[PDB]
Write a protein that binds this ligand. Structure first.
Ligand SMILES: [Cl-]
Ligand SMILES: [Cl-]
Ligand SMILES: [Mg+2]
Ligand SMILES: [Mg+2]
Ligand SMILES: [Mg+2]
Ligand SMILES: [Mg+2]
Ligand SMILES: [Mg+2]
Length: 428
């Protein structure tokens, strides 16, 4: 008889677990492989949770093939199709389907960051590397499900989620969401809006509306996420925040060159002064947040806004990205991002008049916060936002931009330099 899935995986080349296939033999995945869990999708298709001999765990879309026995599914094999069908139609797994899932067919691969377009209307995203058993990984499945359950719709419509039932949070193995082919992210559309403002093709009112819509979206998002509950920050939590933020400040002060570096070195005492007041913020509410929130995570098409990318903050250790944080963290991420959009327009656009752009920077931050506060109040969710955190967390956001610059793009130091120039009290 044909072996079971376990015997096929144990006998398969260890490169089975790799999306891009076998690599150089000198650094091959160590075998033998072991199948820890298997969701049978029918007709020779499956989702495996596979362990390599180094204890690393993997999500593997599998297909039985008479050529080699088993191999990793490729776009066009139909495994993503079969996952979608299992949504429309083993205790280790949780398959959650949402309204709108349909058994669409036809697969096309696309390169992101593995993602497979199905029926030219849905996107299946396979997790690849998983955390160790019982350890936290990406919270994207918990975020998307909480949003859908809360009636939040300003995101690609969820079709389904496949998770492994273990640990504090179910481990994400695959997500299926609506495909938005004609959608750009904010680093395209927000820059274009403000550029058009600078050219006089939009009025200030027109160029400010997206900032208000973003504020409403963020408030709707937080209200839905907060329905899963909240956790008061402890004294140790806020103390840890200050240590981390001061260390990042010290690194930026030690690495930023030139005039920007001199001004930052002169500003560091005041920034540190503000970080010091975090000790009085013990008890501030922590909720499930987006955690990596900025205009690049917002798709816009035909006046519809959609937030994506719920894996968490990529600079935190992988096992901390699911942790709850202050809602104000997302708030400052977006308001900082809006400021930066304005800085980029001025820096990149020939013959631009910075006066209207800088007026827009200030007015856009006010438009966002007003809409955010008004929407939270309309949703009776006012108390998740502790605005005492605005200044310390915003400063820390700008310091992160210095570190990005010195590590990846040196000239980018102008963004936090000009942002902080306008943020800091002009009394110093
Ligand atoms: Cl500027
Ligand atoms: Cl730039
Ligand atoms: Mg072989
Ligand atoms: Mg090999
Ligand atoms: Mg080796
Ligand atoms: Mg993103
Ligand atoms: Mg991400």
């Amino acid at each position: 008889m044909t072996p079971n899935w376990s015997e096929l995986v144990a006998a398969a080349d260890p490169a089975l677990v790799l999306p891009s296939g076998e690599r150089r033999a000198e650094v091959a995945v160590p075998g033998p492989l072991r199948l820890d869990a298997l969701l049978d999708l029918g007709e020779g298709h499956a989702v495996g949770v596979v362990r390599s001999a180094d204890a690393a765990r993997w999500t593997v879309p599998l297909v039985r093939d008479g050529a080699g026995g088993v191999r990793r599914s490729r776009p066009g094999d139909g495994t993503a199709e079969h996952l979608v069908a299992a949504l429309a139609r083993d205790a280790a797994f949780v398959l959650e389907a949402f309204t709108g899932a349909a058994p669409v067919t036809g697969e096309r691969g696309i390169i992101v960051d593995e993602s497979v377009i199905v029926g030219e209307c849905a996107v299946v995203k396979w997790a690849v590397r998983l955390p160790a058993e019982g350890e936290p990984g990406s919270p994207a499945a918990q975020r998307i499900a909480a949003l859908a359950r809360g009636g939040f719709t300003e995101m690609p419509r969820p079709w389904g989620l496949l998770t492994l039932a273990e640990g504090a949070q179910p481990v994400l193995l695959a997500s299926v969401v609506a495909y938005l082919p004609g959608a750009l992210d904010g680093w395209d559309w927000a820059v274009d809006d403000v550029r058009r403002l600078a050219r006089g093709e939009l009025t200030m009112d027109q160029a400010l509306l997206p900032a208000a819509q973003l504020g409403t979206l963020t408030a709707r998002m937080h209200a839905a996420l907060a329905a899963r509950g909240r956790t008061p920050a402890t004294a140790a939590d806020v103390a840890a925040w200050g240590v981390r933020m001061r260390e990042e400040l010290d690194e930026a002060v030690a690495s930023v060159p030139g005039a920007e570096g001199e001004r930052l070195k002169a500003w560091a005492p005041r920034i540190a002064d503000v970080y010091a007041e975090l000790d009085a913020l013990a008890g501030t509410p922590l909720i499930d947040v987006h955690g990596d929130f900025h205009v690049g995570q917002i798709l816009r098409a035909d006046g519809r806004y959609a937030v994506v990318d719920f894996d968490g903050n990529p600079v935190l250790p992988a096992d901390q990205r699911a942790a709850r944080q202050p809602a104000a963290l997302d708030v400052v991420g977006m308001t900082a991002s809006l400021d930066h959009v304005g800085r980029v327009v001025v820096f990149r656009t020939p013959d631009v008049d910075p006066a209207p752009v800088r007026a827009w920077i200030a007015a856009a931050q006010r438009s966002f916060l007003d809409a955010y506060r008004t929407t939270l109040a309309r949703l009776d969710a006012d108390d998740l936002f502790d605005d005492r955190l605005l200044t310390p967390l915003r400063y820390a956001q700008e310091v992160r931009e210095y570190l990005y610059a010195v590590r990846h793009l040196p000239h980018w130091v102008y963004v936090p330099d000009l942002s902080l120039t306008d943020l800091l009290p002009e009394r110093l």
